[PDB]
Amino acid sequence: MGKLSEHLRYCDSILREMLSKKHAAYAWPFYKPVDAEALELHDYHDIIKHPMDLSTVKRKMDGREYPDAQGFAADVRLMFSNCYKYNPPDHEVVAMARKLQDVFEMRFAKMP
């Protein structure tokens, strides 16, 4: 695969930070697709029409599917939005999403 553009090399760095040990205490719920059968979330796919998670963002980045930084960011925000949408606002996983999202939004805004 071709080299990523400058902006996307920075985005790849954000992705690797979001998957790193540093943020694992709150990032782990986003590592893989929500397994609705395994978790018995019978209504998950009724409510969330476009699932997203970090392994999928990685698959897409490694496959050069993002045309620009905005495309990457849309997927990342979709991942957080799905979490806020599906779950009750007081669930632990919502607080974990928000902690991770604080990291994302700060790193993304400082993109050179």
Ligand X SMILES: CC(=O)NCCCCCCNC(C)=O
CA 74 to chain centre: 9
Q: Minimal distance in Å, beta carbon 79 to ligand X?
A: 8
Q: Minimal distance in Å, beta carbon 86 to ligand X?
A: 5
Among residues 2 and 89, whose Cβ is nearest to ligand X?
89
Binding site for ligand X (CB under 6 A): 29-30, 34, 39, 83, 86-87, 93
> In this structure, which amino acid lies at residue 96?
M
> 21 — alpha (psi -120 to 50), left (phi > 0) or beta?
alpha
Q: Minimal distance in Å, beta carbon 30 to ligand X?
A: 6
**Joined tokens for residue 87:** 């779950």
